[PDB]
C-alpha cells in the first residue's frame, strides 16, 4: 500500500519504475479479483515521488510524470510526460487519445485477408509508452467470469522507453507467463479440409514415412464427423461431433493406429450450431440439461452456461477422447456475442485450456487470437489466409510483430489456406517461413488443387519441401530450449529486429526480418523470383558483427543494409561469429528425446548455448577456441561436432572438452564458385555471362570489380553480383 | 390469440409458419393499429411448438426456431436459428445485425446517380431469412398519422427460404397489395422538360401520329407554370401552381385537344415551396388558411396539416383538375424533414394516391419510392438518371431487384434524365430496355439536346426507335394482364431469374436477365457495340427447355449459359416451346379494348395464357397441338392465330378451336442466312469472312464447324460464331 496512492475517485499502483495501474471508481470500491486480462498485481516494492496539492496529484517514477488534476477521467485531466527524448513533441499521454508510435500487435485472424490487415496496438512504442485498457469482466479465484469491475476504468500505463523484453517480462508478470508448450507440438503438422477415410489418412501417414517426412501431429478436419448426412431442418453440416462411419468405421482402432505411429490426434470442432437431436451425444446432453427431446430442443452453443461447458467437455468431448483424440482444434468463426459481453472465443480458448490439462501435462488447443492475456491459452491458430504472395510478404512481420502483446505461438496455415493462385515457388517460399516459425502446420482448403503434399509438386519443389520438413525436425531441440525460455523468462522465440537493437533506425525498416531464438537472424524471400536471375531475394539489414548464411558460410560484415539473393530452394538464414546451434542428428527417428546431438559451431568468436530439455540441461560453451560440453545429469546421449565446414567430433558420450584452435575456421564458400553459380542458371545472354565472368577473374582490385559491375545494364544483376563482392571482400 | 405469445415486454405473433411480428412494450401496451408500412395482421391460424421456461422461450415452425432469452432486445437475447443448410454458418439471424445473402430490395431515387447506386435491403435471402423492421407511425381507421406507435421495437421476422414468391405475396398480405393499375398507364408516355406552347405541344402530338408512334400519355414539365417571370423576392419558379398564359392562354381548350386525341394529362408538381402570395390560388388558400395577405404570408408546404392537405387538393389541385388534368407527377426532392417525423414524400404518396381516387377509378401518380409498402401508391418514378451507358448497365436489375420489397411499378426516365452524353446507340438501347420495363416514359433535361423524339436521330436509329414503341402499344394486353395479376396474386410482371430459378446458381449470376410476366426472358444489351462485330452482346443463361428468340424464332436448347450477339436493332427476348403471347393487331386504333388480338405460339410443348381484360377473361390453351380459345363473356373480338411463322387463322369471331398438329412447327430461322449477315456487317477482313463462311459451309460435322471456329484470332468474332452453331446444333 505504499506502492498504492487514492486521489478523488481515482487509485495508482506503481507497480514498476514503468508500469502504473490507473483506477476510477464512483463507488470508493477499487477491484482487487483478476480479470480475463490480468492475473497479478503481486510486484516487488519501487521507489518513486508524489507532489500532493488540495486539487491535483503527480506521480514521478524515473521514467513518467503521470499527472491527475481531479474529476472525471478526461484527455485534460489525466495525461502523463514520458523522461524520454524520443520525439520532439509525442512525449505526452493524453487519457482516451492516440499518439504516435506504437509498434502495434496483433489481430484476432487472417481469415479471408489477402495480404495486408489493420493490427491493434501493443505495449511496444518507439516514443517509449503505451496504455493497456483493461475492459474485461473479473474472474472469481478458481477462474470463472465474476462480472463487471468495480474500477469502471482500469488502465495500464507502460513507459519502458525502448526497454521492449523488459516491457513484455513485465506484462507476463501482470497477465501470467506463457505456459511450456509440449515438444510434440514443435515438429511438422499435417492437416487438410479434405473427407479422408480411416484407410486414405493412414495411408498418407505411411506415404510421409516413404518419402523421409517427418510428422509429430496428424490434424483431421471436420470431414471426421457428419457433414452430408446432417438433415437440413437441423441447419448445415459444420458443426459435427458424430463420427462419419462410412469414413471412420472404428474410431479407436483409428486414433490407435496414429498413436502406434507417435502422432498426436486433434479434430476440428465448429462449437457454434452446439449439440443437435441428431448427435451420437444429444440422448446423453439431453438428459444431463433437461432437454426436450420430444421437440428436439437443441443444447445451443453457450460456454456463459456452468452445466452446458460441463456438458460440452464431459459428455460430447469426453467419449472422443476415450477414442484417443489428445486436443482440440477450436476453429469459431462466429462472431463476438454473448449475454455476459464476454467474447464466446475467450470463454473456449480459456475453459478449453484448462480442461485440456486433466488428461495430458502442458496440452494444447488450436484457436484464434482473444484479445491480451490470451497467449495463456497457445498455441494461436490464424486461420483462413488467401492464398497469395500478398499473404506471404505479410506474414513474417505479423508474426514478429505479435511478440509486442506477447502472443507468441502463432500457427499459421503454412502455403496459404483458401482462394488465391497457384505457384509452386510460392508454396515452398512459404514453407521456408513456416520452418522458421512459432508452428510448421500445413493445412488447405476443400479443393481437390490445394493439397501442401511435397510430391503434389515437380522433382525440385517435392525434394526442397522434404529437405525444409526435415530441417523442422533438426530445428526441434533448439525450439523446445526456446519454448521453456518463453514459459519462465518470458523471452519471445521470434522478435522484431528492434528487441535486440532498439537504437538503431534499419532495424524498423526491415519488417520481415526477425532473430529466430537467440543464435539465428532469418529474412524470409516472400517475392517471387526474377526470372533473369532465377532467384528471389529480399533486403537484409546486418548488425554490427560478422554474419555467416546458416546453410552456406557465406560471410557478411556488419554493419550494412545489402541486397541478398537466393535460388528457390535456399532461404537467407544467418548466424553470427560464436553462433552454436544444436541440431538433432536423427529428426527421422522416433525418441521422445535426441540420442545424438548435432553441435553447429560458427567460428571468429566465443559463444555458448544452453540446450534446456524435460529432464536435463546441457551447456556448450566456445571459449578461446576451446569447446565444452557439461550436463547437469548424465546420460548415454552422443554429442557430434561441427566446427565451420569440418565434423570434428563423431558420437562421443558423456561430458568433454576439444581444443579447435588448431582446426580449419573457413567455409568453403568461395566468390569464384558462387559467381560460377549465379551467372550459370541467370536467363540473360550468354555473352554478358562470358563478360562478366572473365573481367571478375581477371580485374584484381576489389575496388574496380565493384566499377565493372556498376557499369552492367541490368540493374538487378548488379545488386546481385555486388553482394557476392561484398562478402568476398 | 393462439398465434399470439406474450413473454416477459416481448410479444410474437406467429402469421405463417414463415413469417413472425415481434415486438418489444415497456408500457405492457402493444400495437393492433395499422403503420404507414402494414396494413392488416390477420392471417389463417397455423400450428407451431413453443418451449417456455422459467427465462426464456423458444418458439418453432417448420422454417424456423426463434429464441428469446428475456430482457431488452440486444443480439444476446433475441436472435434465431433457421431450419435450412443454403449457408455453413449464415444460419441465425442476431438482433439488429446484418447477415450475409439479403437480395436487395430499392431506394427512394436514381437521382444524380452515373450507373451503380446501394440499395436498401428486401425481404429475400439466399439463406432464407430476412428482418423487416417497422419504425412507422401508426394509422388512424381512416389512414390518418395518429404518432408513435406503442410497440417500441415491431420486427417482421421472415423465414421462407428460397420460396419469394410466397414470401412477396405474404408480404402484400402484411403491407396490402399493390392496386390495379388503370390500362392507359401501359401505353408510350411522351415528357420533356421543355417551355413547349399549346400549340406547338400538339404539333408535336400530331406529329407522333404521323409518324405511327402511339402514345398514352402527356406529361407537361414545369414550365407549364410561371418560372422566369415569378419576381425574386418569392425565391425561385421551381414550385408553382399558375399557367403561364403565352404559352397557355386557355389550359381548359389545350386540355380538352389532348383528351379529343386520347391522352391522359398530368402536369410536374414540385410542392417544396407551397403557395405564395404570386400565385392564382392564393387568395383562396390565404383566405382558408387565415393567412396575413398584406404581409403576402405564404402557404408553406406543411403535409403534416390537414387544414394545408385540403386547401392543397380542393383550392390548388381542385382547380387545375376542373381544367382537365387527369393525374399528379409529384416531384419530390427537398428532403425527409417534418415535425412528425414522416416523411414528406410518404405524406405526399399516401394522401394524393387516395385524393387521386375521387375523379377517376383506379387511378395513379408518379412518385419517388417513399418505402416499404409505398407500393400501395403507383407508379415509382426513379428520377434524374445521368445519362450513360453505365446508367442503363445498372437499370434492369435495379428494377427486377425492387421486386424483392413488393415495389413493381418503377418507371424510369427511358434513355435517361440528365448530364452524361450523346451516342443514339445508347438511347435505343435504353428504350429496347424500357419497352420491356413496367413503364415506358420518355423523358429528359433543360437541354437543346436531350429530346427522346424517334426523328432527333438518323433514319436508321428513327425507324428502330419506332417499331420498339408500336411493340409497346401491341404488348398492352399482356401487361394489363399481368398488372391484374399483380394486384390479385401478388405476382410481380418484372421477377429476377432466382423466383423461378431458386436453386440454380446461375439463375444468382445474371443481374440484368428477368421474367417479364409468365411467358417472355429478356436479356437487354446495356454496352455499347463492339464495332468490329457490328453487335452488341450479352450473356444469357437459358434454363432446362428449348427456347427461341421472341423476335426471330431463333432456337436455343437449356441449360446453358451462352453469349448472345444482336444488331443495335434488335433486342434478346425469349420464349419457351409452347409459349402462347396475345398482342393487340392494331396497336396505333384509338379504342378502350382491342377489336383483334394476334395469338403468338411457339411450337414444340403444350401451353396456356389467361387474358384478364376490365370486362373479360380469355382462355387461350394449347394441347397435343389443339388450339382453343374461350371467354367467360361473348364479344365481336376478331382473333389471329400465329403458329411459329405462319398467319394460320385471320380475323375469326367467337369461341373456336382449330389443329395445328398438321401445319409447320419450324421457324424460317436458319445458320446458313444468320452467318452470311454476321459476316456481312462485320468491319473485319474480307478475307476472314471469305474463308469462314467456305469452311462453316464445308465443313459438315457439327465438332469440326466448332474446332474451326476455335481457331480464329477475334476471340469475340468466335463467340459470335459459336453462338449461331450453337442454334444451329
Ligand atoms: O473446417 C473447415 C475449415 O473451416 C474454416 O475455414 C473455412 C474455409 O476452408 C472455407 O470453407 O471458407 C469458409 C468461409 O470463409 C471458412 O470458414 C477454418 O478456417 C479452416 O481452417 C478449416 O479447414
Ligand atoms: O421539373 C423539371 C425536372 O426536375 C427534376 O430534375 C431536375 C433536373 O432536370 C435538372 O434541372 O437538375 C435538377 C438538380 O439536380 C433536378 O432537380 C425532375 O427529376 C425531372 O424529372 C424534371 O424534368
Not at 680 to 686: L, M
Not at 692 to 718: C, D, G, Y
Request: glycine share 6%; charged share 25%.
Amino acid at each position: 500500500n505504499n506502492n498504492i496512492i487514492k486521489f478523488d475517485k481515482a487509485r495508482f499502483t506503481v507497480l514498476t519504475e514503468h508500469l502504473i495501474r490507473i483506477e476510477y471508481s464512483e463507488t470508493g470500491e477499487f477491484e482487487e479479483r483478476m480479470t480475463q486480462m490480468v492475473q497479478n498485481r503481486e510486484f516487488s516494492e519501487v521507489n518513486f515521488d508524489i507532489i500532493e496539492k488540495e486539487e491535483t496529484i503527480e506521480i514521478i517514477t524515473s521514467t513518467v510524470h503521470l499527472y491527475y488534476n481531479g474529476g472525471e477521467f478526461t484527455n485534460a485531466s489525466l495525461f502523463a510526460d514520458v523522461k524520454f527524448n524520443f520525439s520532439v513533441y509525442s512525449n505526452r499521454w493524453y487519457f482516451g487519445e492516440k499518439s504516435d508510435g506504437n509498434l502495434k500487435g496483433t489481430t484476432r485472424t487472417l481469415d479471408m485477408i489477402d495480404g495486408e490487415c489493420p493490427l491493434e496496438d501493443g505495449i511496444m512504442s518507439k516514443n517509449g509508452f503505451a496504455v493497456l485498457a483493461d475492459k474485461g469482466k473479473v474472474l472469481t479465484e478458481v477462474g470463472d467470469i465474476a462480472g463487471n469491475s468495480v474500477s469502471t476504468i482500469d488502465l495500464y500505463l507502460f513507459a519502458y522507453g525502448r526497454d521492449y523484453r523488459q516491457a513484455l517480462k513485465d506484462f507476463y508478470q501482470l497477465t501470467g507467463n506463457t505456459p511450456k508448450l509440449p515438444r510434440f507440438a514443435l515438429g511438422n503438422w499435417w492437416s487438410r479440409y479434405y473427407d479422408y477415410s480411416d484407410k486414405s489418412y493412414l495411408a498418407l501417414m505411411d506415404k510421409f514415412t516413404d518419402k523421409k517426412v517427418p510428422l509429430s501431429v496428424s490434424v483431421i478436419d471436420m470431414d471426421w464427423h457428419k457433414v452430408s448426412e446432417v438433415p437440413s431442418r437441423f441447419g448445415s453440416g459444420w458443426t459435427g461431433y458424430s463420427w462419419n462411419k462410412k469414413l471412420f468405421p472404428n474410431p479407436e482402432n483409428f486414433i490407435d493406429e496414429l498413436h502406434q505411429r507417435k502422432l498426436k490426434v486433434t479434430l476440428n470442432d465448429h462449437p457454434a450450431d452446439g449439440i443437435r437431436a441428431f448427435e451420437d451425444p444429444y440422448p446423453q446432453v439431453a438428459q444431463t440439461l433437461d432437454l426436450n427431446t420430444e421437440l428436439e430442443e437443441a443444447a445451443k452453443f453457450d460456454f456463459d452456461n456452468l452445466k452446458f461447458r460441463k456438458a460440452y467437455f464431459e459428455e460430447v468431448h469426453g467419449p472422443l477422447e476415450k477414442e484417443g483424440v489428445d486436443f482440440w482444434w477450436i476453429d469459431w468463426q462466429q462472431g463476438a456475442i454473448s449475454k455476459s459481453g464476454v467474447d464466446p472465443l475467450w470463454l473456449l480458448n480459456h475453459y478449453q485450456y484448462q480442461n485440456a490439462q486433466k488428461k495430458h501435462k502442458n496440452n494444447i488447443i488450436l484457436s484464434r487470437y482473444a484479445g491480451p492475456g490470451s497467449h495463456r491459452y497457445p498455441l494461436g491458430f490464424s486461420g483462413a489466409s488467401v492464398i497469395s504472395w500478398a499473404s506471404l510478404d505479410f506474414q513474417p512481420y505479423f508474426t514478429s510483430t505479435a511478440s509486442n502483446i506477447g502472443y507468441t505461438w502463432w500457427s499459421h496455415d503454412i502455403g496459404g489456406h483458401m482462394q488465391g493462385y497457384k505457384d509452386a515457388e510460392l508454396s515452398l517460399r512459404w514453407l521456408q517461413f513456416g520452418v522458421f516459425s512459432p508452428i510448421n502446420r500445413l493445412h488447405s482448403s476443400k479443393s481437390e488443387f490445394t493439397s501442401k503434399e511435397p510430391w503434389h509438386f515437380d522433382a525440385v519443389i517435392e525434394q526442397s519441401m522434404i529437405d525444409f520438413l526435415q530441417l523442422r525436425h533438426q530445428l526441434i531441440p533448439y525450439l523446445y530450449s526456446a519454448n521453456l525460455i518463453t514459459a519462465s523468462e518470458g523471452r519471445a522465440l521470434v522478435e522484431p529486429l528492434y528487441y535486440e537493437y532498439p537504437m538503431e533506425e534499419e532495424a524498423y525498416q526491415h519488417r520481415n526480418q526477425y532473430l529466430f531464438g537467440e543464435q539465428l537472424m532469418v529474412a524470409p524471400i516472400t517475392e517471387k523470383m526474377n526470372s533473369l536471375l532465377q532467384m528471389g531475394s529480399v533486403e537484409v539489414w546486418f548488425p554490427e558483427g560478422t554474419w555467416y548464411d546458416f546453410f552456406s558460410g557465406q560471410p557478411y560484415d556488419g554493419k550494412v543494409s545489402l541486397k541478398v539473393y537466393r535460388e528457390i530452394t535456399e532461404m537467407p538464414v544467418f548466424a553470427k561469429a560464436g553462433a552454436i546451434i544444436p541440431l538433432d542428428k536423427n529428426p527421422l527417428k522416433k525418441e521422445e528425446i535426441p540420442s545424438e546431438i548435432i553441435w553447429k559451431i560458427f567460428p571468429g568468436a566465443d559463444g555458448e548455448y544452453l540446450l534446456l530439455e524435460e529432464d536435463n540441461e546441457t551447456k556448450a560453451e566456445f571459449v578461446n577456441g576451446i569447446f565444452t560440453v557439461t550436463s547437469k545429469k548424465e546420460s548415454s546421449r552422443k554429442h557430434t561436432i561441427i566446427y565451420g565446414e569440418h565434423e570434428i567430433v563423431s558420437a562421443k558420450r558423456g561430458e568433454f572438452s576439444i581444443d579447435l584452435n588448431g582446426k580449419e575456421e573457413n567455409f568453403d564458400w568461395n566468390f569464384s564458385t558462387a559467381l560460377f553459380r549465379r551467372l550459370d542458371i541467370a536467363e540473360i545472354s550468354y555473352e554478358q555471362k562470358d563478360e562478366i565472368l572473365q573481367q571478375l577473374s581477371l580485374i584484381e582490385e576489389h575496388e574496380k570489380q565493384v566499377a565493372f559491375i556498376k557499369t552492367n545494364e541490368n540493374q538487378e544483376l548488379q545488386n546481385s553480383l555486388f553482394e557476392l563482392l561484398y562478402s568476398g571482400k
